[PDB]
Amino acid sequence: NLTTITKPLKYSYINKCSRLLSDDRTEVPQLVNANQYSPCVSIVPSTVW
Amino acid sequence: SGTPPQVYNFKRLVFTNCNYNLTKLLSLFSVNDFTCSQISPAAIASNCY
Ligand SMILES: *[C@@H]1O[C@H](CO)[C@@H](O)[C@H](O)[C@H]1NC(C)=O
């Protein structure tokens, strides 16, 4: 009996967040710290397809 | 070389006292997934084991 808040289509999350270097051969993962956001949210929208 | 085996009969290569160069090993490959546990990806290529 509470409809004023809505519901999305589905839940979604990120399972891999790394970066390529200039050699295009090595991958460096990123670890988000407390109360910030990893830069890899700049390439994936709020809803993963 | 040769036909690779399935997951339940993988073939082993042991390495003790030999020179390894992954810059010429993995150059013949293309990494789709690279995951590691308890060490960094860059720890293997530099630290002597
Ligand atoms: C920032 O703008 C670029 C320009 O198209 C876009 O590709 C990217 O998704 C945007 N990032 C966010 C978090 O909206």
Which tokens sit at B43? 């720890």
Is A26 an 8 Å CB contact of chain B? yes
How far apart are the C-alpha atoms of A11 and A9, rounded to whole Å? 7
Closest-approach residue (CA) in chain A for B23? A25
Q: Are B30 and A26 in contact (CB under 8 A)?
A: no
Contacting residues of B for A30, CB less than 8 Å apart: none
Q: First CA to last CA across chain B, in angstroms?
A: 26
Q: How far is the CA of A36 from the centre of ligand 1 (A)?
A: 18
Residue B29, φ and ψ in degrees, nearest 5:
-125, 170
Resolution (A): 4.4
Question: Is there a contact between A47 and A8 (Cβ–Cβ < 8 Å)?
Answer: yes
Q: Is A23 on the interface with B (CB under 8 A)?
A: no
What residue has token string 């390529």? A20
Q: Is A42 in the pocket of ligand 1 (CB under 6 A)?
A: yes
Give, for B44, the enclosing helix (H) or strand (E): helix B41-46
HEC string of A1-49 equals CCCCCCCCCCCCCCCCCEEECCCCCCEEECCCCCCCCCHHHHCCCCCCC
